[PDB]
Enzyme design. Structure first.
Site, PDB file in Angstrom:
ATOM      1  N   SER A 224       0.813  -1.239   0.000  1.00  0.00           N
ATOM      2  CA  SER A 224       0.000   0.000   0.000  1.00  0.00           C
ATOM      3  C   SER A 224       0.824   1.256   0.000  1.00  0.00           C
ATOM      4  O   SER A 224       1.874   1.310   0.654  1.00  0.00           O
ATOM      5  CB  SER A 224      -0.985   0.008   1.197  1.00  0.00           C
ATOM      6  OG  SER A 224      -1.697  -1.229   1.181  1.00  0.00           O
ATOM      7  N   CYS A 400      -8.024  -1.295   7.537  1.00  0.00           N
ATOM      8  CA  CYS A 400      -6.885  -1.822   6.830  1.00  0.00           C
ATOM      9  C   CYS A 400      -6.045  -2.681   7.778  1.00  0.00           C
ATOM     10  O   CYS A 400      -5.835  -2.325   8.924  1.00  0.00           O
ATOM     11  CB  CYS A 400      -6.009  -0.662   6.314  1.00  0.00           C
ATOM     12  SG  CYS A 400      -4.453  -1.176   5.495  1.00  0.00           S
ATOM     13  N   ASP A 445      -9.252  -2.736   3.218  1.00  0.00           N
ATOM     14  CA  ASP A 445      -8.044  -3.124   2.523  1.00  0.00           C
ATOM     15  C   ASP A 445      -7.366  -4.151   3.433  1.00  0.00           C
ATOM     16  O   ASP A 445      -6.569  -3.822   4.290  1.00  0.00           O
ATOM     17  CB  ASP A 445      -7.154  -1.925   2.246  1.00  0.00           C
ATOM     18  CG  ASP A 445      -5.900  -2.268   1.423  1.00  0.00           C
ATOM     19  OD1 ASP A 445      -5.900  -3.242   0.652  1.00  0.00           O
ATOM     20  OD2 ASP A 445      -4.902  -1.545   1.540  1.00  0.00           O
ATOM     21  N   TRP A 447      -5.143  -7.631   4.091  1.00  0.00           N
ATOM     22  CA  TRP A 447      -3.871  -8.003   3.445  1.00  0.00           C
ATOM     23  C   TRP A 447      -3.586  -9.469   3.451  1.00  0.00           C
ATOM     24  O   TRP A 447      -2.630  -9.900   2.796  1.00  0.00           O
ATOM     25  CB  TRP A 447      -2.696  -7.251   4.076  1.00  0.00           C
ATOM     26  CG  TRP A 447      -2.736  -5.776   3.813  1.00  0.00           C
ATOM     27  CD1 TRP A 447      -3.523  -5.143   2.917  1.00  0.00           C
ATOM     28  CD2 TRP A 447      -1.958  -4.747   4.460  1.00  0.00           C
ATOM     29  NE1 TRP A 447      -3.278  -3.793   2.932  1.00  0.00           N
ATOM     30  CE2 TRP A 447      -2.328  -3.520   3.880  1.00  0.00           C
ATOM     31  CE3 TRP A 447      -0.961  -4.756   5.428  1.00  0.00           C
ATOM     32  CZ2 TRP A 447      -1.736  -2.302   4.245  1.00  0.00           C
ATOM     33  CZ3 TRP A 447      -0.398  -3.548   5.811  1.00  0.00           C
ATOM     34  CH2 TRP A 447      -0.780  -2.338   5.221  1.00  0.00           C
TER      35      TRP A 447
END
Length: 448
Positions: A224, A400, A445, A447
């Site tokens: 990112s 995130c 977002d 991961w």
């Protein structure tokens, strides 16, 4: 002193009853199709200009900030974008594997690939991820995921290239119906790769063609954007923990991730610039609202803070251009283990607060002795403000980080918050969040 193993001890190479004495249901052999001859003969390359260790020396996970110099490219990005990094396998791993296949002395030969005239595979095509005519070295380094856990069908194929009776038998067990538990335990959970298996089964001598039918593509790893081009023009930052995990390796206990292990090695001398190849992701949605008046909530435990550093940098610059502007609130919920080890960006966050860019910062410490332990507990403590932002003020929330569990935990917290704040049923609360996601005001977002 000798390695002495007791009769009851099972391992990758050894089963115990019942499996050791079981009748096996073995899958059918995959049809070979590749013919190999060894012939004697929008991607941007960017320098690493800076790297910083963000964690103390005694942090369990090492977090690095890496700066790339994008100035001599036409690459552009916005905060929250991701980009892909093209990484190689370890030179020592590639050498060990080629050595084990008795191919090290042919490492500079060009690999010419065809489909066998006599193959029983229908629809056989050359693997797209093996560039035709590249060196064996190049292909193993850049093209093949040599770390991949061998599937049961690959193990099945290796049975036929194993000459020792006990070793051949163990491989049959490992790919069979009856050996499911042993495969899950000793191969899958253990993260065993091809080299690990071949070292464990020394009589297995598979042909290169078989490896090239089974080893998958070495995929680029996305990172990112952890900066704004307004704040560091001509640079791009990203932040990553060096991944370390327990594996089947006999002489090493922790193995490092492929991409993060490589990056850490590259930046050792910067911590003649090393260069890496990157490419943009064409679609990116994890972005600040176009309307800067809109309030936002950011939830980013650990390295999940990364895009939010970029969001805050961007807003700092936007605010500098237009004081007196109507800028919405910015909330950050950050979490880490220890205030004194892995409190990433502590000083920069202090800066953002001091200058009125970050409106509220709520930090949780999951392993400090006592208070909110995780981001979800802090979100719950501020449920009234969170509900009002999302439901009366058109706000957006962003989540995130590496854990999918974290994402679920945050989600469930928000479900509770909306039920209690508006005084609706858990079911209506759940559908509200789903409609928030549908409207692109609840973004993730994640991961892993």
């Amino acid at each position: 002193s000798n390695v002495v193993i007791e009769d009851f001890e099972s391992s990758l190479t050894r089963s115990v009853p019942p499996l050791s004495q079981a009748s096996l249901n073995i899958p059918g052999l995959p049809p070979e199709y590749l013919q190999v001859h060894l012939q004697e003969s929008p991607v941007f390359q960017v320098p690493i200009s800076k790297a910083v260790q963000l964690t103390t020396n005694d942090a369990i996970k090492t977090t690095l900030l890496v700066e790339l110099d994008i100035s001599n490219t036409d690459f552009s990005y916005q905060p929250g974008d991701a980009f892909s990094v093209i990484c190689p396998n370890s030179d020592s791993e590639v050498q060990s594997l080629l050595q084990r296949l008795q191919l090290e002395d042919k490492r500079e030969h060009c690999v010419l690939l065809k489909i066998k005239a006599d193959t029983k595979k229908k629809g056989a095509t050359l693997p797209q991820h093996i560039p035709a005519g590249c060196s064996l070295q190049f292909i193993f380094t850049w093209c093949l995921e040599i770390r991949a856990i061998p599937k049961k069908a690959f193990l099945r194929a290796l049975v036929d290239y194993t000459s020792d009776s006990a070793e051949k038998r163990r491989l049959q067990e490992l790919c069979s119906k009856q050996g499911a538990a042993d495969y899950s335990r000793f191969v899958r959970d253990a993260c065993a790769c091809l080299l690990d298996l071949l070292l464990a089964f020394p009589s297995c001598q598979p042909p290169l063609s078989l490896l090239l039918e089974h080893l998958p593509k070495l995929q680029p790893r996305p990172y990112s954007c952890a900066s704004s081009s307004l704040f560091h023009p001509g640079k791009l930052h990203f932040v990553f923990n060096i991944v370390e995990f327990l594996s089947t390796a006999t002489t090493e206990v922790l193995r490092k991730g492929v991409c993060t292990g490589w990056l850490a090695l590259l930046v050792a001398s910067v911590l003649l610039a090393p260069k890496i190849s990157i490419f943009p992701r064409t679609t990116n949605s994890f972005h600040l609202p176009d309307d800067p008046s809109i309030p936002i909530i950011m939830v980013g435990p650990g390295t999940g803070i990364a895009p939010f550093i970029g969001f805050l940098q961007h807003r700092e610059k936007l605010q500098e251009q237009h004081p007196d502007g109507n800028f919405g609130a910015m909330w950050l919920f950050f979490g880490c283990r220890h205030k004194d080890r892995d409190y990433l960006f502590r000083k920069e966050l202090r800066h953002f607060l001091k200058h009125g860019i970050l409106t509220h910062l709520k930090v949780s410490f999951s392993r400090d002795a006592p208070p909110a332990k995780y981001v979800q507990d802090n979100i719950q403590l501020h449920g009234q403000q969170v509900a009002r932002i999302l439901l009366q003020e058109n706000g957006h929330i962003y989540v995130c980080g590496d854990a999918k569990n974290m994402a679920k935990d945050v989600h469930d917290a928000l479900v509770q918050i909306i039920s209690k704040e508006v005084g609706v049923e858990k079911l209506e609360a759940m559908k509200t969040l789903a409609t928030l996601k549908e409207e692109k005001r609840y973004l993730q977002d994640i991961w892993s």
